[PDB]
Structure 1
Amino acid sequence: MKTLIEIKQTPDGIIKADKVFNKVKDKISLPNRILYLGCGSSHFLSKLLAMVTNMHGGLGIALPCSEFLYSKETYPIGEVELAVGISRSGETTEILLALEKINVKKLGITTRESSLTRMCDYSLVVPAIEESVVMTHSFTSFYFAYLQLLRYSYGLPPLNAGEISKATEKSLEYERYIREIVESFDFQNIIFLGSGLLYPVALEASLKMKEMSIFWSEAYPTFEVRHGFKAIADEKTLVVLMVEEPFEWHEKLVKEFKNQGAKVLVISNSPQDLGQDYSIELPRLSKDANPIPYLPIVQLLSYYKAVSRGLNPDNPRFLDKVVRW
């Protein structure tokens, strides 16, 4: 098994990411208008990067590779000063096809020299090597490397890699707790909730559960879930609410789901009791880096659920490590 080992390499991945950042920081200038392209988990990472770009005063837009390829006219792309292609393998056909249609500067984010790096002007090669078909610590490592570069390019002070790495070590301390939730509550479906930067994390968490456990998992911007989506949550459902600073509406939402019979796990940077059945408190970090510790938590949850179902997260049925056409 490699998936669990790879999730546990998250702390080191942060350090590796910082090293890459420092090597290329004075070689790559990130502009104001940036387009982020990726497929699957890399698309969710693209969404996260676009969001943090907007958070820091820039203009970031993210699109799934195939939507850019065949339906770009329906998206608010506008003028692009830099196109960022994200691919763990650097060999996904769609990203290669997408970038070849772009004429502006191109930056690749991948784990190794590849077809992708060969067609980009420069790349962030973060060696967060993964043998599992399911992406885990590379998501987190890629995010940190680019975030550092973005802050640097925009004239902001650097983040403390050591502190962020330690924060993910704290996330990993919840391994036993997470395993026991999986062993005690045999949920049949699950919903991940998050807002802002935590929304793409919810999307990624849902995909991890989907791929690793061949599972009925959904993800939504925190409060959007009340609009019909919540109809599928009952006593067989685990609702995972991820929130940095909860307020009154969060307590009401937790209670609403419990009233439907569902159990609720709250992953937050707050000690507040919202009425949740399970609680995971993570170290609060700079707003942009704060989502990082959440990733190993949702990855561990998906891994243990997969094992509890006798499934192999390293090679989910029907999936290829690299999607080609």
Structure 2
Amino acid sequence: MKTLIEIKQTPDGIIKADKVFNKVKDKISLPNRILYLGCGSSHFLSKLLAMVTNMHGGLGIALPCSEFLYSKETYPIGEVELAVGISRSGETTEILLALEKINVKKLGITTRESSLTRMCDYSLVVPAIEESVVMTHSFTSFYFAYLQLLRYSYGLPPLNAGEISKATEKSLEYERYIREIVESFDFQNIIFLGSGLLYPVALEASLKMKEMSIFWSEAYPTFEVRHGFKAIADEKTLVVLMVEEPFEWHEKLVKEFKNQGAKVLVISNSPQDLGQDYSIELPRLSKDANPIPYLPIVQLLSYYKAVSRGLNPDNPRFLDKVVRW
């Protein structure tokens, strides 16, 4: 349905993102200290943007919109040179309320002209239009558009959009394999693991499982899971480890989970056999862009698990396309 069609539009989304970046790159200059605000999937995207900002020498902080609204004093926001508001629809009430209280320069990230773009000074309107209640390629597209702008603003060379777009096409080749995983192992719960830039991807992947499949899904920074959290993983659990360059600890972690009876899917940019049950190797890209090919993989996994449960990921129970108050 719509969710699947939209996941498959990821390659074109990258191209659309590159186009928007080039249109606004000389009109907007991203500063050193940046605050990122978003809700749900957009909060996880905010965390990813904050992380890559720090990775490139800046200082980025991300907070859920409502936490900024009602409990900002408990967060290390400090002086902000730019506030970035993220909303797929550009109509999320909380982001609009948050921006009303902000006096510094404001940059919006959304898929269309909206209430959001009207209260921001500049905006990245990436037309990765989605009919599904669940965000898929818009997340990936928003990330690339901003990443290009960030590298540019920081004096780094632009990434090759064509190469990255082709990388996501490679991700999509795994569709049948992912479908087979869902068919051959009827897991009852799942855990996503990632470190650094892949941690927010793990968080997003888990949310995709919740929304699309109404499923018991969790996400943790790779090795944090050993500290108590692993207690809920057994023979009915699928553990998804996402890692660019694994080392000995990763092999031990995989073995640890298998010893509890869980099956493990490793998604990486490495040919190494860590003892996993399922393996997905993705094209290795510039460190900052490397997480991109992982998104369509976890989105497809969530989609097919949803279908296997007879659910409609396009319109999950209890969820609204836009969260308003």
Question: With structure 1 as the length reference, what TM-score do the two structures score?
Answer: 1.00
Q: How far does residue 99 in structure 1 lie from its aligned partner after superposition?
A: 0.4
SS of residue in 2 equivalent to 1:254: helix
- d(CA) in 1 for partners of 2:128 and 2:218? 27
Q: How far does residue 11 in structure 1 lie from its aligned partner after superposition?
A: 0.1
> Are positions 1:3 and 2:3 aligned together?
yes
Find the counterpart in structure 2 of residue 178 from structure 1.
178
Task: State the superposition RMSD in angstroms.
Answer: 0.2
SS of residue in 2 equivalent to 1:167: helix
Q: How far does residue 10 in structure 1 lie from its aligned partner after superposition?
A: 0.2
Q: How far does residue 146 in structure 1 lie from its aligned partner after superposition?
A: 0.1
SS of residue in 2 equivalent to 1:140: helix
Q: How far does residue 213 in structure 1 lie from its aligned partner after superposition?
A: 0.1
Deviations 1:114-162 (A, max 9, x none): 0000000010000000000000000000000000000000000000000
Q: How far does residue 16 in structure 1 lie from its aligned partner after superposition?
A: 0.1
Deviations 1:235-269 (A, max 9, x none): 00000000000000000000000000000000000
- d(CA) in 2 for partners of 1:80 and 1:73? 14
Q: How far does residue 108 in structure 1 lie from its aligned partner after superposition?
A: 0.1
Find the counterpart in structure 1 of residue 276 from structure 2.
276
Q: How far does residue 204 in structure 1 lie from its aligned partner after superposition?
A: 0.0
SS of residue in 2 equivalent to 1:266: strand
- d(CA) in 1 for partners of 2:55 and 2:241? 22
Deviations 1:59-110 (A, max 9, x none): 0000000000000000000000000000000000000000000000000000
- d(CA) in 2 for partners of 1:320 and 1:20? 28
SS of residue in 2 equivalent to 1:179: helix
- d(CA) in 2 for partners of 1:43 and 1:81? 19
Q: How far does residue 178 in structure 1 lie from its aligned partner after superposition?
A: 0.1
Q: How far does residue 44 in structure 1 lie from its aligned partner after superposition?
A: 0.1
- d(CA) in 2 for partners of 1:210 and 1:219? 11
- d(CA) in 2 for partners of 1:29 and 1:288? 19
- d(CA) in 2 for partners of 1:143 and 1:82? 17
Unaligned runs of 5+ in 1: none
Q: How far does residue 314 in structure 1 lie from its aligned partner after superposition?
A: 0.2
Question: With structure 2 as the length reference, what TM-score do the two structures score?
Answer: 1.00
Q: How far does residue 304 in structure 1 lie from its aligned partner after superposition?
A: 0.1
- d(CA) in 2 for partners of 1:210 and 1:224? 21
Aligned length: 325
Q: How does 1:175-214 map to 2 (within 5 A)?
A: 175-214=175-214
Q: How far does residue 305 in structure 1 lie from its aligned partner after superposition?
A: 0.1
Q: How far does residue 226 in structure 1 lie from its aligned partner after superposition?
A: 0.1
Divergent runs of 4+, >3 A: none
Q: How far does residue 302 in structure 1 lie from its aligned partner after superposition?
A: 0.1
- d(CA) in 2 for partners of 1:249 and 1:43? 29
Unaligned runs of 5+ in 2: none
- d(CA) in 1 for partners of 2:86 and 2:296? 20
- d(CA) in 2 for partners of 1:269 and 1:231? 28
SS of residue in 1 equivalent to 2:103: coil
Q: How far does residue 232 in structure 1 lie from its aligned partner after superposition?
A: 0.1
SS of residue in 1 equivalent to 2:276: coil
Deviations 1:176-233 (A, max 9, x none): 0000000010000000000000000000000000000000000000000000000000
SS of residue in 1 equivalent to 2:190: strand
- d(CA) in 1 for partners of 2:259 and 2:30? 48
